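Structure request: catalytic antibody, Mus musculus.
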Amino acid sequence: LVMSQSPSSLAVSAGEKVTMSCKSSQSLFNSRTRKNYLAWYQQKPGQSPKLLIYWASTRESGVPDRFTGSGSGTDFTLTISSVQAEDLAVYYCKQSYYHMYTFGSGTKLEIK
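Returned structure:
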């Protein structure tokens, strides 16, 4: 199961919006539970990954709603409105539909 993310790098100004794509090589949508097993992670310089969103669009506790996730099947997207300096990080999507989880290439985000 291949996970393709993009773009590779994003350099934007504070307050602008960015959207990043994560394509799975297989539907992560389960007809039974009605859930896409796709999660989005934020990884700040040197730290461990912070779960941002799970089930494609459900935010974790305390995650600001500037972060929006969406999509189903194979095409997913993560939206970050009004980017802040604190968002400086690499964002990774992870599938948890199969026994063995898979991460994406990741998308680096820098704030000018």
